[PDB]
Amino acid sequence: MNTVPFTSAPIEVTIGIDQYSFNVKENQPFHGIKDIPIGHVHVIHFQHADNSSMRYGYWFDCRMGNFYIQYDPKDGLYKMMEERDGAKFENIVHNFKERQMMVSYPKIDEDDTWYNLTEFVQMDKIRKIVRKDENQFSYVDSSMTTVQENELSDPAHSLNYTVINFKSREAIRPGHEMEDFLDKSYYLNTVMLQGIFKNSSNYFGELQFAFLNAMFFGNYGSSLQWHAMIELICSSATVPKHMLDKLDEILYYQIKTLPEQYSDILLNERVWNICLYSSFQKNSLHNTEKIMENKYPELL
C-alpha cells in the first residue's frame, strides 16, 4: 500500500482518488492519501471550491515511482510531481503518517469496483494516449480535446485516442460498401483489433480509460470515444464470444458507477438504444441491459 504526500493544501478543493472524494478546506492540515492499493492504476483529481470550471487530475501507478502533489500558486493548480530520492520520500511520508495528516484510501474489502473499472487499463497505454513523456504520470482535464476532434488546437495537450469513423475509407472496403457499413466486423476485427490494437485487452483498456475520463472530468471527447468503441462492437455481427461477455461486465460496472445525476449528459440515447435493442449484439449484453433498464429506464 503506497502513499501520495501533499506539500500542503493552500486552496479549498475537493479531492478525488479513484471513485472516492473528500473536501479539503483552505489551509487545512492535509498532507495526502495513504493505503492506496498497489496493483492498479489510480487517478487523483481536483475541483477547486472557487472555480468548479476545469476538473483536472493525474493518472499514475505507484509502482512506477514515488509521487507527491504540490500546489503551484503561479499556474494555480495542484501539481503531481516525482521524488527520485527514494529515502528522502520515505522519511517525509513516515513523518506525516506519524502525525496522522493523511486520509486513508477507504477501500471496502468486498469492493471490487475499482478493479472492475480498470481491469484493462495500464499506465503504459495511458501514456500513449496522453503524450507527456517526461513524467511517469498523466495529466487530464475537462477541456482537453481529442486527436479526432482536432481534425474537425494544440497537439501537445490532446488525447490521442484511436480514431473511429464509421463513414471512412479505413472502415469500408471497396466493393463491400453496404456489407461493411451495416456489419462492422471487418472494421472491428481486422482494422482495429488485428491491425491497430493487437488484442481486445488493449481495446477494452482504451474503452475503460475513455469512460473514466468522461466521468471524472466531463471530458466530452472521451465520452464520444467510449460510445464509439461500444457501438463498433455492438454493430459487428461477428465478435469473439469472450469479448462480448467481457464487454457486458465492463459496461455493467461503468453504468453501475455513473453518477445518477450526470446520466443525461454522459449517456448517449441513440447509441444505447441501438446497442441494446437494434444491433447485432442486442441480445448479448444481459447484465448491461438489466442494469440500464432498472436504473435509467428514462433514456430508453
Partner: protein, 237 residues
C-alpha cells in the same frame, strides 16, 4: 446542408449538380399465392438521376434479375442506387463530375455518402422540397424503355426536350415539376390534358408534345387547375 425554397436558384447556377431519386428503383406488384398467401413479384425499375440545369437524365434501368436471391430488398435498393450513381460519376470526365448530388429521400444519404467516400469534394445533400420525380414512370417513353429492358441498361434523355432553346433552366425545371406533380396527383387527367389535341405530336426524339409557347401557357394553366382541383376533391374544398 439541405435544399429548400430559400436556396432554390442554386439549382440553376454553374456548379454541376444532379438530383437522385430512388423511388422507382424497387418496384413490386403484390398478389395472392395459390395457398391464399400474399407474395410480391418484382418488375423493372429505374434510378432517376437528373441535371436540373441541362435537363440531362441518366436513366439507369434496374432489371429484375438484380434482386434474384437477395433479402431485404428495400434496403438493398438504396445501396444499389448508390452503387450505380457512384459508378456513373466515376465514368464521367472530371470536368463533368457533379460538385453536389442531392437525394430526394434522406435514406439515400448514408448509402451514397459511403459509396462516394472516394469523392470527398462532392457534397451529398438532402432536400426539403417534395419533388414529384416518382411520377417519372408516368412518362410513356420512359416507362416503355424500363418495361422492355431484358438486361441492365443506361439510357440518356433530355427531360426538357428542346425547351432550353426558348426558356431558362429555372423555367424549364418549373414546367417539368408542374407536369410531374400533375401526373402524380391524377395521371389520367394529366395525360388527357397533354394529348387532348390530336394535332400536337411528340417528336420521335422527345418525351413531351411539341407545344408552342402559347399552347404551353394553356397547358401549364390547365395542370395548375388539375393540381388545385384534385386537392379540392381530396380535402373537399
Amino acid at each position: 446542408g439541405a435544399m429548400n425554397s430559400s436556396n432554390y436558384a442554386e439549382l440553376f447556377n454553374n456548379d454541376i449538380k444532379l438530383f437522385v431519386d430512388d423511388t422507382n428503383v424497387y418496384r413490386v406488384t403484390v398478389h395472392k399465392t395459390f395457398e391464399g398467401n400474399v407474395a410480391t413479384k418484382a418488375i423493372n425499375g429505374c434510378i432517376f438521376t437528373l441535371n436540373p440545369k441541362t435537363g440531362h437524365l441518366f436513366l439507369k434501368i434496374i432489371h429484375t434479375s438484380v434482386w434474384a436471391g437477395q433479402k431485404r430488398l428495400s434496403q438493398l435498393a438504396k445501396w444499389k442506387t448508390a452503387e450505380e450513381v457512384s459508378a456513373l460519376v466515376r465514368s464521367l470526365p472530371k470536368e463533368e463530375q457533379p460538385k453536389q448530388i442531392i437525394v430526394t429521400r434522406k435514406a439515400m444519404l448514408d448509402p451514397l455518402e459511403v459509396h462516394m467516400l472516394d469523392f470527398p469534394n462532392i457534397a451529398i445533400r438532402p432536400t426539403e422540397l417534395r419533388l414529384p420525380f416518382s411520377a417519372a414512370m408516368s412518362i410513356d417513353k420512359l416507362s416503355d424503355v424500363v418495361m422492355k429492358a431484358t438486361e441492365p441498361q443506361m439510357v440518356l434523355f433530355n427531360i426538357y426536350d428542346d425547351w432550353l432553346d426558348r426558356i431558362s433552366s429555372y423555367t424549364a425545371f418549373s414546367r417539368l415539376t408542374l407536369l410531374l406533380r400533375a401526373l402524380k396527383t391524377n395521371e389520367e387527367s394529366a395525360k388527357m390534358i397533354l394529348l387532348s389535341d390530336p394535332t400536337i405530336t411528340i417528336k420521335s426524339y422527345h418525351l413531351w408534345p411539341s407545344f408552342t409557347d402559347e399552347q404551353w401557357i394553356t397547358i401549364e394553366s390547365q395542370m395548375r387547375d388539375l393540381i388545385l382541383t384534385e386537392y379540392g376533391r381530396k380535402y373537399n374544398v
